[PDB]
Amino acid sequence: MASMERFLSVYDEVQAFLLDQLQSKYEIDPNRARYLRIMMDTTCLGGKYFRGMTVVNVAEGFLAVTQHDEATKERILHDACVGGWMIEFLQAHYLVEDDIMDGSVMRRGKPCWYRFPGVTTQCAINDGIILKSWTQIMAWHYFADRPFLKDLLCLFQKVDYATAVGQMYDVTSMCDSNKLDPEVAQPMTTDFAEFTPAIYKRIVKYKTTFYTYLLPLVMGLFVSEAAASVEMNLVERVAHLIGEYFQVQDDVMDCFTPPEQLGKVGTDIEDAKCSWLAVTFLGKANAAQVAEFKANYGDKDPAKVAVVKRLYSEANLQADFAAYEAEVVREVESLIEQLKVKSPTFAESVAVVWEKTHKRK
Amino acid sequence: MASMERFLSVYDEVQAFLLDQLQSKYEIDPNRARYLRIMMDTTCLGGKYFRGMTVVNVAEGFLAVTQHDEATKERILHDACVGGWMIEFLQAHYLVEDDIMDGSVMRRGKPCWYRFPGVTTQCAINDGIILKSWTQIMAWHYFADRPFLKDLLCLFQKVDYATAVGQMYDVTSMCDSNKLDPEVAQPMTTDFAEFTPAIYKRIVKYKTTFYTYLLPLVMGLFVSEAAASVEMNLVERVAHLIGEYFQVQDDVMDCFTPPEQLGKVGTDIEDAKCSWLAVTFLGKANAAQVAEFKANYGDKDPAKVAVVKRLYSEANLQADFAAYEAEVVREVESLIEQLKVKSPTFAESVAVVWEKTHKRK
Numbered sequence A, B: 001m002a003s004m005e006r007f008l009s010v011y012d013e014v015q016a017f018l019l020d021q022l023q024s025k026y027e028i029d030p031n032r033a034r035y036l037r038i039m040m041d042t043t044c045l046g047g048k049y050f051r052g053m054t055v056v057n058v059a060e061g062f063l064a065v066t067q068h069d070e071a072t073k074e075r076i077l078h079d080a081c082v083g084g085w086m087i088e089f090l091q092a093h094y095l096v097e098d099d100i101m102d103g104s105v106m107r108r109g110k111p112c113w114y115r116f117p118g119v120t121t122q123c124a125i126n127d128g129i130i131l132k133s134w135t136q137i138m139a140w141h142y143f144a145d146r147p148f149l150k151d152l153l154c155l156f157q158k159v160d161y162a163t164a165v166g167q168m169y170d171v172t173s174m175c176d177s178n179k180l181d182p183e184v185a186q187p188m189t190t191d192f193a194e195f196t197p198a199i200y201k202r203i204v205k206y207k208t209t210f211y212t213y214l215l216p217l218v219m220g221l222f223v224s225e226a227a228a229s230v231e232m233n234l235v236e237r238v239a240h241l242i243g244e245y246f247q248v249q250d251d252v253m254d255c256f257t258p259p260e261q262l263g264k265v266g267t268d269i270e271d272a273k274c275s276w277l278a279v280t281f282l283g284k285a286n287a288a289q290v291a292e293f294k295a296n297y298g299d300k301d302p303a304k305v306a307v308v309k310r311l312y313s314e315a316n317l318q319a320d321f322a323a324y325e326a327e328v329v330r331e332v333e334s335l336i337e338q339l340k341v342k343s344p345t346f347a348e349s350v351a352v353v354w355e356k357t358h359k360r361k
C-alpha cells in the first residue's frame, strides 16, 4: 500500500537523523554506525507495522472530519508517522529482549537478533536497550515544541512499565507464586493451580495490551489533539479486550501454525508457558487427561511436546476458541457502539483495528 | 553519617510508594511484590551512594547561601534525595545488565544479581529493565508540578543514551572496527591497534562519565533552580575529567585490588577489555613485551592471566598512573578555579566530589 511506503519513508528520515547525530555528537566511527544501522533495520523492519500504522489510521480519521490548513495536515501525518515509529522501536526493544528471555530461535522469518553470529547475547542486550533510548530521542527531537509532548512521554512511560511488569508475570507464570525466591532455584509448578482464566488475563493485559493497542490508539489521539473527543475509559476497555484476543491468537498460533507460515518457531509448550491453550485444556479436561498433561508439559523432549499437541487437538479447543471469539465479537462491537456516542470517527478507526486483528494469519 | 541515613529514609518512602502502586494499580500478588522488594534492595543498596549523595551535597551548598522558607528547604532536600535515588536506580539498572554482558560473578561483596539461584539471566534482564522504568515513575510522581521536570527528563534521557552508546564502545573494544559484522562471529584483535589513549578516552567518556558525574552534578543544579548560576561548559568539562579518572582507578583496581577489598572480582584481562592498564602498557612496552602481551591477553587461563599481571607490574605502571593523576589534579583544580568566577558554592561542591573520588579504596 502507498500508505505503508510513506510510513517507511519516515523510518528513513529517523534512521538518517539518529545515525548522523551518532557521527556528529557521539564520536561514532563508520563501522559502528554500520552495525547500528543493520541492527535498527533487522529489529525494526519486516513486520506488518500494525502498531505504527494504527497511529497513522487514527490520525487520518480525524483529518477527514477536521478543518486544517494543508501544512497542518502534513505535520499531523508526519507526527503520526514519527509516533508510529516510537512504538515500532519500543516493540523492537521488547522482541529483542523477549527472544533472549524465551530462548527463541526465529523472528520475522530470520534468526532472533541475539543469535546472529556477530551479535550474541552480550551485544543484543545492549542493542535492545539502545532501541528504547532511541524512542526517547525521537520524541524529544520531533515533538520538542508540541502541546502534547508531556502527555505523550508520560503515557509512553506508563505503557512501558506495565509491559515490563507483565513480562515478569509471564516469565514466572510456570512457578508457584509461594515458591518465588531470589535465594532458591525455582521449580516448575506440579499442580498447575495458577493456570486459570483470571491469572492468564492478568498476564496478557500487562505484557501485551498496553503497548500493542492502548498506546497506538491514544498516540493517534495525542498527535491529533483529540483526546478530549473520546471516552478514555472506553478506549482502555476496548484496547485491553482486542489486545487480549490478539494474544490468545498468538497463543494458538505458537502451537498450531506452521513455522514457515508464522515467521517464528513456537516454544510455549517447552517453556511451560501459561498459554490460552494450557488454561482452556485444564478448564475442560477429565482426571486422566490432567495427569497425562502434567507428565508432559514443559519439556524440550519431542515425544513429550508432541503428546501435549495431541491432548490439545483431541480436546477440541476450536470449539472453545470459537465461543471465546464469538463473545469478543459481541463485546468489541458493543464498545464500538459506545464510542460512537462521542466519536463516530474514532469508533470507525477502532472497527478497522478490530477487523485487521480479527482476520490476521 | 546522619545525612546518608536521611537519604536511605527517602529510599524507604520510594520503595513503599512503588510497591503499594504495584498492589493498588498493577494487580500484583504479595509474593511477586516480595521478589521485587528484594530485587530492589539487592541491586540498589549496599554501595557507597556516591551518585545520589552528590545530588544532595550540591543542593545543600546552594541552601547555605540562599534565602528560603524552611518548608522550601525541606522540599529542596527531599527533591535532591529523590533525584539521588533516580540516579542510584539508573546505576542499578546498568550494573545488573553490565554484569550479564561481562560474565561477572560478584558485585558489592555478593553474587551478581543474575547469578542468584532464584533469578537467572532470564529474570534479571527484565529486572534490570524494571529498575530504569522505576526512575521514570519516580520522576513523574515526585516532580509532577516542578518547573525543572522537563529539563530533568530530557537530561536524564540524554545521559542514558550516551551511557548505552558507551557500553557499545566498551563491549566491542576488543574487536577490530573493520571486522564488526552482525553476520560474522567477531574475532578478538591480534594487532591491538585500537588500544590507544584517544580510543580509551572515548570509551570512558560515554560509558561512565555522563551518568556518574555529569548527571548527579547537574541534577543538584536542577533541583536547586541554579543552572543559570554556573558555566555549563565547565560543569561538562570537569564531570568528564573526574569521571575519566574514576574509571582509570576502576581499571587499576580490577587488576590490582584484592576481591575482598574491592567487593567485586576482576574480569578485564580475561574479557580483553580496553583498560587503562592495557593501553598504557602498550604505550611504553618494547618489541618483545608487546609480543608476550599479545600471546596472553584475553584468555580465562590462569597462567596466561597471571603473565599479563607480571608484564603490568614489571612495566612500572605506578609511575604512569602517578603522572596521570598529577596532570588530572592540575586540570581539575583549574576547572575548579574557573567555576569560582560564577559559583563559589558549586566549585566547592566540586572540590568535595573531587576529594572523595581522589582518595577512594
Ligand SMILES: CCCCCCCNCC(P(=O)(O)O)P(=O)(O)O
Residues within 6 Å of the ligand: A093, A094, A095, A097, A098, A102, A163, A164, A167, A170, A207, A208, A250, B126, B129
Ligand atoms: C522486556 C520485554 C517485554 C516483552 C513484551 C511481550 C513480548 N511478547 C511477544 C512474544 P510472547 O508470546 O513471548 O509473549 P512472541 O511474539 O515471542 O510470541
Ligand SMILES: CCCCCCCNCC(P(=O)(O)O)P(=O)(O)O
Residues within 6 Å of the ligand: A126, A129, B093, B094, B095, B097, B098, B102, B163, B164, B167, B170, B207, B208, B250
Ligand atoms: C546498559 C549497561 C551500561 C553499563 C554502564 C557502564 C558500567 N560500568 C561499570 C563496570 P565496567 O568496568 O564493566 O565498565 P564495573 O563496575 O563492572 O567495573
Ligand SMILES: [Mg+2]
Residues within 6 Å of the ligand: A098, A099, A102, A104
Ligand atoms: Mg516470546
Ligand SMILES: [Mg+2]
Residues within 6 Å of the ligand: A098, A102, A170
Ligand atoms: Mg515471551
Ligand SMILES: [Mg+2]
Residues within 6 Å of the ligand: A250, A251, A254
Ligand atoms: Mg507467543
Ligand SMILES: [Mg+2]
Residues within 6 Å of the ligand: B098, B099, B102, B104
Ligand atoms: Mg563490568
Ligand SMILES: [Mg+2]
Residues within 6 Å of the ligand: B098, B102, B170
Ligand atoms: Mg563492563
Ligand SMILES: [Mg+2]
Residues within 6 Å of the ligand: B250, B251, B254
Ligand atoms: Mg571495571
Ligand code: NA
Residues within 6 Å of the ligand: A183, B110, B111
Ligand atoms: Na546470596
Ligand code: NA
Residues within 6 Å of the ligand: A176, A188, A189, A190, A191, A192
Ligand atoms: Na505445584
Ligand code: NA
Residues within 6 Å of the ligand: A110, A111, B183
Ligand atoms: Na542471517
Ligand code: NA
Residues within 6 Å of the ligand: B176, B188, B189, B190, B191, B192
Ligand atoms: Na587484528
